[PDB]
Chain A
Amino acid sequence: VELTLDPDTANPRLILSLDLKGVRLGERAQDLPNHPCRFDTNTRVLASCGFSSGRHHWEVEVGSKDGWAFGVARESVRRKGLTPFTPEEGVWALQLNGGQYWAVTSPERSPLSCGHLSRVRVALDLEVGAVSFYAVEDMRHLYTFRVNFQERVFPLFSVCSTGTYLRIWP
Chain B
Amino acid sequence: AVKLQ
Instruction: Report A's interface with B, CB cutoff 8 A.
Output: 41-44, 67, 69, 82, 85, 95, 97, 158, 160-161
Report chain B residues within 8 Å CB of A43: 4-5
* Pairwise interchain contact B3-A69, C-beta atoms closer than 8 A: no
* Pairwise interchain contact A41-B5, C-beta atoms closer than 8 A: no
Instruction: Report B's interface with A, CB cutoff 8 A.
Output: 1-5
A104: nearest residue on chain B (CB-CB)?
B5
Question: A-B pairs with the 3 shortest C-beta distances?
Answer: A85-B5, A160-B1, A161-B1
**Contact check: which of A41, A44, A160 meets B2 at CB < 8 Å?**
A160
* Pairwise interchain contact B5-A158, C-beta atoms closer than 8 A: yes
Q: Min CB distance, B3 to chain A, in Å? A: 7
User: Mind listing 11 A-B residue pairs with CB under 8 Å?
Assistant: A41-B4, A42-B5, A43-B4, A43-B5, A67-B1, A69-B5, A85-B5, A95-B2, A95-B5, A160-B1, A160-B4
Complexed CA–CA distance, A69 and B2 (Å):
10
Report chain A residues within 8 Å CB of B3: 82, 160
